Symmetry: D3
Subunit: 233 residues, 6 copies
């Protein structure tokens, strides 16, 4: 039905959680969802539909980077009629305004990719999330006690940056972290009239050069998972 998803039309609820790591998508199915079944497995990129607090929710892995994210976000919308996409993952903080275990809501995704220039007349597409969904995130966060960090992230084509000298200038311009997908997520949801949001969990801080132990990563990520599931229920 698509080259990258072997689910049947209707297997996806119109709300979908997105992760890069299909192993994390699997974890969220067995632990936080009821009646969760695997609906897709192409290239080991798992996807699930299930229930949280009585409500129907779908989960989907999307690999790493803007190209990979765009492929799956594209197919989820145009073929499986997903209408809200919430992506959650890790980043590398580059700003002193955030530290470990913080959660970042990206209201802007700057980039060094050419994808949005290709999409958009070789001008500067300000790749942003759906406002209402970010309002749900902010409000849900408050009810759950989370102090959300709000600002821009920088979506890079490079995990190994050739421009680490530019991180202070990115922080200057209200870039709280670097990750690798939100500009594609946001541009794709924009392209296809869909609602998207990206939440970051600070697992590594690239300025102070501190990181979380593998235990704290699981507990830090659990709190971002609950936030996601709570704003979609």
């Amino acid at each position: 039905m698509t080259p990258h998803i072997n689910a049947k039309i209707g297997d996806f609820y119109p709300q979908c959680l997105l992760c890069g790591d299909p192993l994390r998508v699997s974890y969220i199915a067995k632990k936080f969802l009821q009646d969760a079944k695997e609906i897709t497995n192409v290239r080991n990129m798992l996807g699930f539909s299930g229930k949280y607090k009585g409500r129907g929710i779908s989960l989907m892995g999307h690999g790493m980077g803007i190209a990979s994210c765009t492929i799956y976000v594209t197919e989820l919308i145009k073929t499986y009629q997903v209408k809200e996409l919430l992506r959650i993952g890790t980043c590398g903080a580059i700003s002193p305004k955030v530290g470990l275990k913080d959660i970042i809501m990206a209201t802007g995704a700057s980039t060094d990719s050419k994808t949005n220039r290709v999409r958009f007349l070789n001008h500067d597409l300000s790749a942003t999330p759906d406002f209402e969904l970010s309002l749900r995130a902010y409000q849900t966060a408050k009810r759950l006690g989370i102090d959300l960090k709000v600002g821009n992230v920088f979506s890079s084509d490079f995990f190994y940056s050739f421009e680490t000298h530019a991180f202070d200038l990115m922080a200057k311009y209200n870039h709280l972290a670097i990750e690798m997908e939100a500009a594609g997520l946001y541009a794709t949801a924009m392209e296809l009239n869909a609602k998207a949001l990206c939440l970051c969990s600070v697992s590594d801080h690239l300025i102070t050069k501190e990181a979380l132990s593998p235990k704290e990563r699981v507990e830090s990520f659990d709190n971002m998972i609950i936030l996601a599931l709570e704003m979609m229920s």
Copy 2:
């Protein structure tokens, strides 16, 4: 004090409303402020300080275009210690769906300018407002029952576009209007770590060719003015 603003330091309150048109600045000052005093007048670009329901509020004219807009907010921030900046301007609709006189809030300001590539590593800087400002504009308009449209706008260097054929693609990517300053404002407040937001009322319509009137842009947007004053008190 600066080559463009005439004020003593301290003349500006930390919250300032911006318009491109000095007469609209003067109109808001006469009709809505208390204790209004003219603080600057270089190039007939007037600024005012006064009170609105007991609280300090400043007003500043900022001319047309990213370059002119960037001159005035840079000076407000660096020299006159303004901390929150709220542009209330005019725009052209590019979707027949968007009526005339509708108030838009700009969650992101795309642009065809080179200024952000020059500012930002020749990458794509996603020009966005401060989120707490936008939240206070959304909640306030709801409280007032004003109805506010939310999305990206396109900040152009051209009032007279050489790319009218592209208006549909801009509208497809959630661009609600074209104006000429918002990318400048957003970029400069990101550079200098200040809080800024753009609201703009539809004044022109670039598909069905409605307009407008020089005096009509001075008056006729009272809802947009009240909402902005309300959210600053």
Copy 3:
């Protein structure tokens, strides 16, 4: 008539002097014209018509930056049938070849703007003035005993430059000063088949940091005014 000018049709003579500052415009109508009439005042951007030495001359302010200058001279030409546009202003000198009070004739206007690439195939549009206009200025400047300096200016989107390190490079390539309009004026006159030329008064030298007292400024500027009016007469 147009959104930014409220003159009647025919209010403008086919020859027009331009300055960014509408207060110097008004200053030229007061001190130097006969039968000076105000003809437009949208946004306090003042314009006039009058006679100099029995000959009709219009004056028009155009604000700061390429975007704003382009708005006004587009409307002047297309709607009000202006044929010849002589712009005069101050500039920050950038070359050892010019000192204070020097009047520069800009035979080319380089830019950090993206407007001409947007106009011109994403290629390098060389923005140049009308040759006959530049001939008239050189001859008039000669007859008046004015030591006219000829070369390029650099038309920047930034008043507060992020590339002051590049100023030596610009002067190497014959850029005698930095201002913020000439490239838009030349590009718009080329697009619309009109005659344009820009004259810049050295009020500051950005390298050697020397400057002129406001008294030398409204005296130096008057010498240029006389030059502009003599060539229009």
Copy 4:
């Protein structure tokens, strides 16, 4: 060990086969390697080391797109000391010179990505394989009776192209097919002084829309796999 590979030091042989799909890495281990052992499994992205005709050969998945590919190539070369990297995968043919089943040797990889401009002084990097690997491929193909198709591929950041009208121009310039990783693989092998080549099996033909049975796929892709292993031996 790295963020994306949990293999021990010395688990990878110096010659390694690359695919996007971790299900094909597993397919090759079982079908064509003796005593293969799964050595990495982060993010369900498997890698193996086994033997073919008694000679050590490793296999690694790398996901989709230049960004994901570069992460895995970078870690294999820097951390795991792999010297020779042979990518075998699928592509969308766009040339009439190639039918399905056909194996393409990518002597160059053009792209719409910005990554090589970022790596390379914002000039045109001509991303190309190591020639001696390409020679081994050519020679080995002849000894196996395979008519190797040679030419460029286009490495796109998009599976769903916004430029389908350009495919004819692409093929005219000797691009035989489109895929999404070769330009990233080649620039990283070049950056790191490692030998690399990309072989592409025509699964789809985007011009003829002819798309072969799922069974001729494994039979034909087996010919590519065999060609890869014979030259790594």
Copy 5:
């Protein structure tokens, strides 16, 4: 002395005519100069030194294209002390306004080359001639009864263009002809504080369609030659 010029220091006069065609250079030598010695011949690229009606002047070929022209112009200025460079070539008319034999003076050379972006901070260098030279040319053509078209030229890297559809656009921005070297001449002369002018003789009309023979470089058009020699003395 240089890699491309055979001549002794002091062989060139401070004023030099330039052609792309070394044979036209040789034609000018035999037909218009006396006492003419050939002073360089590397790569058959001939240069001469002789007297025009008793007045010293040099002649040099510079090949085709911006890069070729730049090599020769750089060595003439830096090594051989040429101070005034007057190019006289052929060009292609892009309008019915311009005839096949017309002489054009290029007051700006736009280009689709990247050289000026490489030279000039990746911004737009308006490549222009020395103004004093353009005045002599203007005044000498008036003196001789030789009508001179004056305007921009488009300096292309392509003799066989890939953008013939854009010729009308170039014509609209006052680009009277296409040639291939003037932007390099101007930018090199600007670089090295030298004086350059480019005059062009239409040989082909690109839209209207006629084409000149290699052989017809004579009467036909020695009017351009007489103009150049007259203003250089």
Copy 6:
């Protein structure tokens, strides 16, 4: 028959050897070409037709730079029906992997030219030779005892570079040498379905500054000449 070539159609064999310097072409005709006849001489750019070891072979000069090169191979292909173009010339070494008298086979030609972006959708065209021609070069060199160095070259629009600081990075990315035509030849032959290859003799090391004497240049060039004619017979 073309503006730049006055040969008859049929005067060029379908295999042609190219060099920038027509005097090098002239040297090859009188030392190696049997029954050599001069077939063109526009702009002193000599070409020849003859026999080598019984096989029909043409020779053509193409000048310096990408623009100049593109002119001539376009005309050779579309007018005169040349199918194979083998280019030989000198280069300036930038890699420590090569020294003087080395012969480089360019398997890719990176460039700072815009020409390939103008041709190719403003994307990164990987300019490559025909692989069979490069195989013949490799096999022929081995038969002659030539240690052929293989890698990318950088085709620059500048003989006198403005980015000498970048040579190290180019070498890091497997660029052995700088010259000025290979990316034009490769792109022109890709455009027009022809077979091209560039060989370069190291006559200058731009890092260490070592250089061949004029006698050593000739001896070294002879070796490449014989390599070129042996793979064409």
